[PDB]
Amino acid sequence: SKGEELFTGVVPILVELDGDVNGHKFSVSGEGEGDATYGKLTLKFICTTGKLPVPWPTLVTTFVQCFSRYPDHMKRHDFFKSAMPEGYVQERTISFKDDGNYKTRAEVKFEGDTLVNRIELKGIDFKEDGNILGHKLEYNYNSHNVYITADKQKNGIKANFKIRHNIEDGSVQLADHYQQNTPIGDGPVLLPDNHYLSVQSALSKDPNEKRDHMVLLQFVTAAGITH
Ligand SMILES: [Mg+2]
Ligand SMILES: [Mg+2]
């Protein structure tokens, strides 16, 4: 795709989220860069409204799959880059098992040479002392597969996957993800065969940062198609 050529080097990234979870209103700003040649993302997020009222790990998936590494032989399946620069809408329902849900609506597009992810997040039905509002999730992140299928009537894709957040007691908080993406612009976009994204993520803290924040290093490779 024409879109793919926008990702052959290092691309600056901005993330901006406004959220309301059970009436706790908050905002997050993030900055970093992506190098899709290596499936590589580095991002630092800051809660600009004070303390984040949900655990940072629960927002990782919401906070740019155009930075996935699609192997050359899978280039024709890369919807995300093909929608660029005009971008795509990315919507999800994230269902925390035995707890509340997030509904997210994001637009991912270029502003100049910078790839921007602007998100609105709404969370409802959370338990006041569940794992989310009670801040019982470990500050770490597991590796997951994102299963992608075409959504031809929307000129886009959908995805399903299961995120597992480690709980401080050693248990796991499941977050089921359902996802739909739709292109914003009028260029041709790629409608993929079934495949998945193999994701690994590492969370850290900036020792000099006293605002509430998260540093994310992530690697993503598309897979599941051999030819
Ligand atoms: Mg700012
Ligand atoms: Mg075929």
Residue numbers in the entry: 2 to 64, 68 to 231
Quote from the publication:
Green fluorescent protein (GFP), discovered from Aequorea victoria, emits green light after absorption of blue light. GFP has a β-barrel fold, and the chromophore is formed at the center from the three amino acid residues Ser65, Tyr66 and Gly675,6. The protonation state of the chromophore differs between the two states, A and B. The phenolic group in the chromophore is protonated and neutral in the A state, while it is deprotonated and negatively charged in the B state. Spectroscopic measurements of the photoreaction of the A-type chromophore revealed the presence of the excited state proton transfer (ESPT) reaction, and a photoreaction model was proposed that includes the intermediate (I) state in addition to the A and B states.
The crystal structure of the T203V/E222Q variant at pH 8.5 was determined at a high resolution of 1.2 Å where the respective non-hydrogen atoms can be observed separately. The diffraction precision index (DPI) for the average coordinates error was estimated to be 0.07 Å. The quality of the electron density map was sufficient to distinguish between nitrogen and oxygen atoms and between carbon and nitrogen atoms. Thus, the conformations of residues such as His148, Val203 and Gln222 around the chromophore could be accurately determined without ambiguity. The Nδ1 atom of His148 forms a hydrogen bond with the Oη atom of the chromophore. The Nε2 and Oε1 atoms of Gln222 make hydrogen bonds with the Oγ atom of Ser205 and the Oγ atom of Ser65 in the chromophore, respectively. For the distance between Nδ1 of His148 and Oη of the chromophore, average-strength hydrogen bonds were observed in the T203V/E222Q and T203I/E222Q variants. To investigate the interaction around the chromophore in detail, the optimized structure with complemented hydrogen atoms was modelled from the crystal structure of T203V/E222Q by the QM/MM method. The atomic structure of wild-type GFP in the I state (IT) was modelled by the QM/MM method from the crystal structure of the T203V/E222Q variant at pH 8.5.
